[PDB]
Write a protein that binds this ligand. Sequence first.
Ligand SMILES: CCOc1ccc2ccc(-c3nn(CC4CCNCC4)c4ncnc(N)c34)cc2c1
Length: 454
Amino acid sequence: STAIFSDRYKGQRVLGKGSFGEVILCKDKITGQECAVKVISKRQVKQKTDKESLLREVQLLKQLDHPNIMKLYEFFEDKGYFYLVGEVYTGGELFDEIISRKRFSEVDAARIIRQVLSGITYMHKNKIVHRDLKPENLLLESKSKDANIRIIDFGLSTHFEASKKMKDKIGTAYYIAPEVLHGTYDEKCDVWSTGVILYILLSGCPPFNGANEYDILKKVEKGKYTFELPQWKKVSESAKDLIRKMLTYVPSMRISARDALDHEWIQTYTKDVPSLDNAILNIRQFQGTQKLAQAALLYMGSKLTSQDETKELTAIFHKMDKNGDGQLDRAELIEGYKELMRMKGQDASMLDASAVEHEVDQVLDAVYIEYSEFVTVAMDRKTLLSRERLERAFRMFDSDNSGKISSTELATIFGVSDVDSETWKSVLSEVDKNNDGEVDFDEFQQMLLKLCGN
Ligand SMILES: CCOc1ccc2ccc(-c3nn(CC4CCNCC4)c4ncnc(N)c34)cc2c1
């Protein structure tokens, strides 16, 4: 008797989109235990290993235990999906918490990096490599100031192939070890990624940077970086030495995780130190830029999904409309909405028939029934979560409350989003015919619609 995920768990709400799938906050129907479930769609994500290889890795991961590593509880599989059930953490992404503080010292950085290295060392002892370590995979356990870091996604990348879509790729290039680019890699790739993260904590800029993804990858692959930025003048020698050893090009010459834990810098600063004010400022700029580019990509995707699902839904209902009345009942709206969830594959949110009944009932309570009006409301439902996140992200990036984003800023944003320069300028030309060389929110939004075939 294979076991079924929704026999045990009900969905509370969506937490977000992470690597390889959606993550939903769920609750055990019997014990009331809350968990975070990552749902991997087989249609969207190809496997790299056989089933046997994956089952044994899962079995090992369920037994591992370390305070800086996400705890995995269960694994389920059906026809369309894999369901990975882990512990929920509520403190959010590390960098989002850091930009909220007024001071940040080498002691704060050292304490963070010790945690990361400790998790990594443990996982490497157990022969598991992350490969895709980056700031998004570092979660704080709770919203308290002290809270431990929990690393998510250890072990995934070995069994599943990453998306080639930019909306899923944002940020990845800064942190990937050069040997991963060329194909021969081992556990030392995780030390490199940590080194890049450390460099960024102490300066607020990527050691390997550029105007688009490929430019970044080119800097990484050559492997040269410098400490010639002004803000490095305030930083201890021992920190730069540890950095150097983690960013050592040839993996066999690069320091191990375990030895980095013993480095003088970790020893000194984790047991007369200024705030790194310039680094906090750079980090909040870095962060805001990354989050706005992500928000702009998800908005464009959400718009295209809606164009696709609106027309599909209408044709399902038209077919269903026996009498040509333009009128369906509740059971019919439910069966058509279900039909949409079968064809499509988008709503981890609609785990079972019961979540679909509730969603239908929410739309009805807002709005025999005219199906064309039901279609209108059901779809806005799914967007504005992305339209209002767009707006939130624009306001967060406009830190001066100017209401405006300059041409230069757009060039940075679209570069990170990997939208071609002559393409966005062309779209900007069609909206900015006053030559202001700056845009307000509504103008920015209009550009994005034009960049996704609207
Ligand atoms: C082998 C490791 O693979 C797995 C398996 C299960 C997971 C469950 C949740 C999550 C996981 N992902 N997220 C959501 C993301 C939203 C925005 N970006 C960062 C976090 C969580 N939020 C809170 N608590 C969690 N446990 C998770 C990741 C998993 C990874």
